[PDB]
Amino acid sequence: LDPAIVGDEHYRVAQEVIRILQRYKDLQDIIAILGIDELSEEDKQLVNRARRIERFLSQNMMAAEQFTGQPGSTVPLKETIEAFDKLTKGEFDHLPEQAFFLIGGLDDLAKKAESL
Amino acid sequence: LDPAIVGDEHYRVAQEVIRILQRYKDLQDIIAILGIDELSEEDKQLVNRARRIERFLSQNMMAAEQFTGQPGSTVPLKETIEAFDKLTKGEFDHLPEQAFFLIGGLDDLAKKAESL
Amino acid sequence: LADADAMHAKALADAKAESEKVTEEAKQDSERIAAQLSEQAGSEAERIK
Amino acid sequence: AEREAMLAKTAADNRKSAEQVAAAQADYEKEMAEARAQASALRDEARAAGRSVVDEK
Amino acid sequence: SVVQRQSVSEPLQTGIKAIDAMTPIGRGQRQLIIGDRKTGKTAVCVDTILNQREAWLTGDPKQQVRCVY
Amino acid sequence: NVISITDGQCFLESDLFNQGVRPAINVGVSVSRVGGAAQIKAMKEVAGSLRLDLSQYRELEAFAAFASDLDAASKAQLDRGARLVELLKQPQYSPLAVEEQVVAIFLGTQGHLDSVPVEDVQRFESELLEHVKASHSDIFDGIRETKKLSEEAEEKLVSVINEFKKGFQASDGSSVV
Amino acid sequence: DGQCFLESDLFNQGVRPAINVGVSVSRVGGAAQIKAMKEVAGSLRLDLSQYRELEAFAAFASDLDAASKAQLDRGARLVELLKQPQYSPLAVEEQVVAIFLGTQGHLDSVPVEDVQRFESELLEHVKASHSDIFDGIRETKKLSEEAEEK
Amino acid sequence: TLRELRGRIRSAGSIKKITKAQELIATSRIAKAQARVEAARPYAAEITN
Ligand SMILES: Nc1ncnc2c1ncn2[C@@H]1O[C@H](COP(=O)(O)OP(=O)(O)OP(=O)(O)O)[C@@H](O)[C@H]1O
Numbered sequence: 001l002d003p004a005i006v007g008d009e010h011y012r013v014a015q016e017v018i019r020i021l022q023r024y025k026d027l028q029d030i031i032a033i034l035g036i037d038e039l040s041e042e043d044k045q046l047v048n049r050a051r052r053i054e055r056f057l058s059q060n061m062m063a064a065e066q067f068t069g070q071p072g073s074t075v076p077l078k079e080t081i082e083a084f085d086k087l088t089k090g091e092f093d094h095l096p097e098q099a100f101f102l103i104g105g106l107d108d109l110a111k112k113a114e115s116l
Numbered sequence: 117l118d119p120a121i122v123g124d125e126h127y128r129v130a131q132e133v134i135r136i137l138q139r140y141k142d143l144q145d146i147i148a149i150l151g152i153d154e155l156s157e158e159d160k161q162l163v164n165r166a167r168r169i170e171r172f173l174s175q176n177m178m179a180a181e182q183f184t185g186q187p188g189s190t191v192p193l194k195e196t197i198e199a200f201d202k203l204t205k206g207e208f209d210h211l212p213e214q215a216f217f218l219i220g221g222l223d224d225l226a227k228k229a230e231s232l
Numbered sequence: 233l234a235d236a237d238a239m240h241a242k243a244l245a246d247a248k249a250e251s252e253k254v255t256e257e258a259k260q261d262s263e264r265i266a267a268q269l270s271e272q273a274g275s276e277a278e279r280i281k
Numbered sequence: 282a283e284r285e286a287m288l289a290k291t292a293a294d295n296r297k298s299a300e301q302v303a304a305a306q307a308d309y310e311k312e313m314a315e316a317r318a319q320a321s322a323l324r325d326e327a328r329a330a331g332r333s334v335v336d337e338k
Numbered sequence: 339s340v341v342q343r344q345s346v347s348e349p350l351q352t353g354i355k356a357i358d359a360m361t362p363i364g365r366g367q368r369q370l371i372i373g374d375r376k377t378g379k380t381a382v383c384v385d386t387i388l389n390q391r392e393a394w395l396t397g398d399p400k401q402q403v404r405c406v407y
Numbered sequence: 408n409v410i411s412i413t414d415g416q417c418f419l420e421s422d423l424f425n426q427g428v429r430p431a432i433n434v435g436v437s438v439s440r441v442g443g444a445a446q447i448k449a450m451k452e453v454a455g456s457l458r459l460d461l462s463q464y465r466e467l468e469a470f471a472a473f474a475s476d477l478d479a480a481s482k483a484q485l486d487r488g489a490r491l492v493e494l495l496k497q498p499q500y501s502p503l504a505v506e507e508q509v510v511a512i513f514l515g516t517q518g519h520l521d522s523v524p525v526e527d528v529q530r531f532e533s534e535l536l537e538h539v540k541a542s543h544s545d546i547f548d549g550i551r552e553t554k555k556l557s558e559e560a561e562e563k564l565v566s567v568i569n570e571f572k573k574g575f576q577a578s579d580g581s582s583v584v
Numbered sequence: 585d586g587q588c589f590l591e592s593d594l595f596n597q598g599v600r601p602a603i604n605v606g607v608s609v610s611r612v613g614g615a616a617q618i619k620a621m622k623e624v625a626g627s628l629r630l631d632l633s634q635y636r637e638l639e640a641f642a643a644f645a646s647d648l649d650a651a652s653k654a655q656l657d658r659g660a661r662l663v664e665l666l667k668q669p670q671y672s673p674l675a676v677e678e679q680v681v682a683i684f685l686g687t688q689g690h691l692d693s694v695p696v697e698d699v700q701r702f703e704s705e706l707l708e709h710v711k712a713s714h715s716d717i718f719d720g721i722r723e724t725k726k727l728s729e730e731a732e733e734k
Numbered sequence: 735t736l737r738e739l740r741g742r743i744r745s746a747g748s749i750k751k752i753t754k755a756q757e758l759i760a761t762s763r764i765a766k767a768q769a770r771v772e773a774a775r776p777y778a779a780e781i782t783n
C-alpha cells in the first residue's frame with residue numbers, strides 16, 4: 001500500500017477512511033455513556049457517516065446464495081474508488097440504513113434504495 | 117466438610133468467612149494505593165469485618181510458654197461456632213484493634229475490652 | 233358505609249379455600265415422599281439380600 | 282352549628298375506604314403467609330421424619 | 339479410516355445446566371477438561387457417568403450406553 | 408500438545424470455586440467446535456444467545472460497582488445478568504433431566520423472575536419446579552414427545568408462573584404483575 | 585538455630601545495625617537471656633512488626649484515631665531509641681535500664697529528635713548517684729520493688 | 735522472579751479499570767454541573783438593573 005503504486009487518490013481515500021473509523025472508535029465511549037444527543041452536529045454527522053460506511057463496506061458473496069439465494073458479483077477497481085471518493089463527503093446520509101448493504105455496484109444499490 | 121455429615125450451620129459459616137476473606141484479598145491493591153476513602157460503604161464495612169476476622173483467628177497455645185509468658189488456653193467447638201456467627205453477623209464492630217489479638221475465649225475478649 | 237361490609241365474606245371464603253387446598257397439597261406431598269422413601273428402603277433391602 | 286359536622290363526615294369518608302382496604306389486604310397477606318408457612322413446615326417435618334425412620338428401618 | 343465416518347448429530351446429555359447450555363457435547367466428540375488442584379473435575383465426571391440410569395431403564399439398546407472408567 | 412490435539416475445552420478456575428459458583432466453570436474461554444449441530448431444537452430456541460448478555464453484563468458491572476446513576480436499560484441489563492448468574496448455580500449429586508432444564512432456562516430468559524430479589528431466587532425456582540411436577544404433567548409429555556415448545560404450552564406455563572408467584576414470599580416480598 | 589536478615593534499604597534509611605526484625609528469629613527463645621531481661625523486655629518483636637504493618641497500611645489514611653495515633657507514637661519512639669552507633673560497648677545493666685525506660689512510657693512526652701541524646705544523658709547521671717542499683721543487679725540478676733521505685 | 739511480575743500485572747490492570755470508571759463518572763457529572771450553573775443569570779441581570 002503506497003501512494004506511488006496504486007495512485008494518490010487510493011492513498012487519500014484509505015487515509016480518510018482510517019481516520020474516520022478511528023474517530024468513531026474513540027467516540028464510542030461517549031456514545032455509550034451519554035449518547036449521540038450530546039454530540040455536536042459535526043460529531044453526530046461523522047458518527048452517522050462512519051456507521052453508514054461500515055454498513056456499505058460489506059459485499060454479497062457467491063456462496064451466500066446457499067442461505068440467501070443471491071449470487072455474488074465483482075466490481076472494477078475504478079468504479080469502487082470513484083464511489084468511495086463520492087461517499088467521502090457523506091452525501092448519502094439521507095438514504096435509509098437498510099439500503100446501504102451492498103450487492104454490487106453503485107447504480108443497482110441506488111436503484112434498490114429508490115425501490116424501498 | 118459437607119452438609120451431608122455435618123450440620124449446615126458449619127457449612128454456611130465457613131462459606132461466608134471464605135467469601136469475605138476472598139473479597140478482601142481482591143480489594144487489597146486498591147486499598148493500598150487509592151486508600152480506604154475511595155471505596156463505598158459496603159466495601160468499607162467488608163474491609164472492617166475482614167480485619168476483625170483476620171485478627172480473631174489468632175490464639176495462644178501452651179507450647180508458647182517457653183517463648184512468651186502467656187499461659188495456655190483452649191476453647192470448645194460450639195462456642196467457636198457461635199462466636200464466628202456473631203462476628204460474621206456484624207455486632208462486634210465497636211471494639212478497637214488490639215482487643216481482637218491473641219484472644220482465647222469470648223469472656224477473655226470481654227475482659228480485655230474492659231481493660232482498655 | 234353500606235359498601236364497607238362487602239369484601240370480608242369473600243376474604244373469609246378465599247381464606248378457607250386456601251387452607252383446604254394447602255392441606256390437601258401438603259397431605260399429597262407427604263404421603264408421596266413417605267411412599268418412595270419406604271420403597272427405596274425396601275429396594276435396598278432386597279439389594280442387600 | 283351544623284355545617285362542620287358535614288365536613289367532619291366528609292373527612293372521615295375520605296379515609297375510611299383506604300383504611301378498610303389496607304386492613305383487608307394486610308389480613309389477607311398475613312393469613313396467606315401463615316397457611317403457606319404451615320404447609321411448608323409440615324412437608325419438611327414429614328420428609329425429615331420419614332428419612333429418619335427409613336434410616337432406622 | 340477417513341471413509342468410514344459420518345457427521346455428528348446427537349443430544350448426548352450431561353446432567354449439568356452450564357455445560358450443555360454453553361458447550362454442547364455429542365456422540366463421537368472428544369471433549370477435554372483441564373483443571374487446577376481441588377476444583378471438582380471428578381464430581382462432574384461422576385455426575386455424568388451416573389446420569390444415564392433412566393436411559394438404561396428403557397428396553398431397546400438405542401438409548402442404552404455402556405460406560406467404562 | 409493435548410489442547411492442540413483435541414477440540415472443545417472447559418476451563419475450571421479456582422477463584423470462581425472459592426466463592427459463589429459451585430460448578431465454577433469459566434465462560435469467556437470455553438468453546439465447543441460442534442456447537443449447534445449437537446443441540447436440541449427446543450433448548451436451542453430457548454437459549455436466546457445469553458452469551459453476549461453475560462459478556463456485556465460482566466463488562467458493565469465492572470464499571471457500575473461504584474456507579475449509582477446509570478441508564479435505565481443499562482440497569483435492566485445488569486440486573487438480568489446478575490439474575491442469570493445467580494440462577495446458573497447448582498449443588499452436587501443432583502442431576503437434572505432435559506425438560507426441567509428447558510423450563511428453568513425459559514423462566515430465566517423471558518424476564519418472569521426479574522421481580523424476584525436475587526438473594527432467594529434459587530429456592531423459589533426449586534419450589535416452582537416441584538409444584539410444576541406435582542399438579543401438572545402435560546408440558547413434560549409434550550416436550551418429551553415433540554422436542555419443541557408450543558405457544559399454548561407457553562401460555563399455560565405463564566399462567567402457572569403467575570399464579571404461583573402470587574403466593575410466594577421470602578422476606579418482605581411483593582407479588583407484582 | 586537462628587538467622588538475621590540485613591537489608592541495604594534499611595541501612596540507607598538510617599538504621600545503623602540494619603537488622604530486619606520481621607524475619608529474624610531465634611529458635612532457642614528467651615531461655616538464653618537472663619531472667620531480668622525477660623521480665624523487663626517481652627513480646628517486643630510483635631509490637632515492632634505490627635507497627636511496621638500499620639505504618640505501611642495507614643500511610644495515606646484520611647484520619648487517625650486515639651489508639652492509632654498512640655500506637656504510631658509508641659512505635660516511633662521504640663524504633664528511634666533502638667539505634668546504636670559503632671564502637672559503643674554496652675553492659676547488661678545499662679541495656680535493661682534503657683529497655684525498661686522505653687517500655688514503660690517514661691519518654692512519651694519527649695519529642696523524637698531528642699529521644700537518643702536524652703537517653704545518653706541519663707545513663708551518665710546514674711553513674712555517680714544511686715550507682716549501688718547496678719551493683720545489686722550484678723549480685724541478683726533481677727530487679728526488686730525498692731530498686732525499681734528508687 | 736515470576737510471581738512479582740504477575741502480581742504487578744494484576745494490580746496495574748485493576749488500577750486501570752478503576753481510573754477509567756472514575757473518568758467516565760466525572761464526564762457524566764460535567765453535564766449536570768453545566769446545566770445547574772447557567773440558571774442564575776436572569777435574577778442577577780434584574781437585580782443589577
Ligand atoms: N456442586 C458442588 N457443591 C458443593 N460442593 C461441591 C460441588 N462440587 C464439588 N464440591 C466439593 O468440592 C470438592 C471437589 O472434590 P473432588 O473429588 O471433585 O476433587 P477435584 O477437585 O476434582 O480434585 P482431585 O481429583 O485433584 O482430587 C469436594 O469437597 C466436593 O464435595
Ligand SMILES: [Mg+2]
Pocket residue numbers: 377378379380381
Ligand atoms: Mg478430584
